[PDB]
């Protein structure tokens, strides 16, 4: 396995180099948006991001060493969390706004265009506000995003061979923790500040899981309400949580 032989700086480089591109929306500013069009813009965008996310996950150290079935399980449980922390991250420099795409920049008032979407918008804005107060760094973001991918489905999987698969994931997770600590020491933080910032960053993943859980339920209520058509890949991901 190559993941356990990477240094801290090599881990950061590999993660940064694997970053997916920032995709555009088909947003027409002349057009008026109803509920069905915004959720169509968001669904279209999310579906194209899932393709990049899948090919991004293959470049995460240790992910390729997992079995194909384990890769499917992790992405199925973590996909919306990863979309959300990415959205939150690129929205840091736009207070009060969520930057879904460079051409699609929405505030909570436009979030009211969809019923119940307001609550999820506020939680995302609050998370983006927390990242701004913490002055989250790009090197730390890519670490947290890979932690989500590896951690969110690890509890949800038996044999002596399947244990070594969970054991490998926890070895990679520890490697990423060493990487985060390496980053914070490199920035001049003391040992007390390093452990404090590590806790602060990992406690945000709790709130991101909460947003994903809520957002997942809202997507389900949409699939029945039947008004906004979901892509085939997004419906398969949605069925994985039920």
């Amino acid at each position: 396995s190559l993941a356990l032989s990477l240094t801290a700086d090599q881990m950061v480089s590999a993660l940064l180099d694997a970053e997916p591109p920032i995709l555009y929306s088909e947003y027409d500013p002349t057009r008026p948006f109803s509920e069905a069009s915004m959720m169509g813009l968001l669904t279209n965008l999310a579906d194209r991001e899932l393709v990049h996310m899948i090919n991004w996950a293959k470049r995460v150290p240790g992910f390729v060493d997992l079995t194909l079935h384990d890769q499917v399980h992790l992405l199925e449980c973590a996909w919306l969390e990863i979309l959300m922390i990415g959205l939150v991250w690129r929205s840091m420099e736009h207070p009060g706004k969520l930057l879904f795409a460079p051409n699609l920049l929405l505030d909570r008032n436009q979030g009211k265009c969809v019923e119940g979407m307001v609550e999820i918008f506020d939680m995302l804005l609050a998370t983006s506000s927390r990242f701004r107060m913490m002055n989250l760094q790009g090197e730390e973001f890519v670490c947290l995003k890979s932690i989500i991918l590896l951690n969110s489905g690890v509890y949800t999987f038996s044999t002596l061979k399947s244990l070594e698969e969970k054991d490998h994931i926890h070895r990679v997770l520890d490697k990423i923790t060493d990487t985060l600590i390496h980053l914070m020491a490199k920035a001049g933080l003391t040992l007390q500040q390093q452990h404090q910032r590590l806790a602060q960053l990992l406690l945000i993943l709790s709130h991101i899981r909460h947003m994903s859980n809520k957002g997942m339920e809202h997507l389900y209520s949409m699939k029945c309400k039947n008004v906004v058509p979901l892509s085939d890949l997004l419906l398969e991901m949605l069925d994985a949580h039920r």
Binding site: V51, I54, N55, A57, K58, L68, Q71, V72, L75, E76, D232, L233, E236, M237
Partner: peptide
């Protein structure tokens, strides 16, 4: 079988 399955193994 799944779309995600195919894209993951796709080379």
């Amino acid at each position: 079988h799944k779309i995600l399955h195919r894209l993951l193994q796709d080379s």
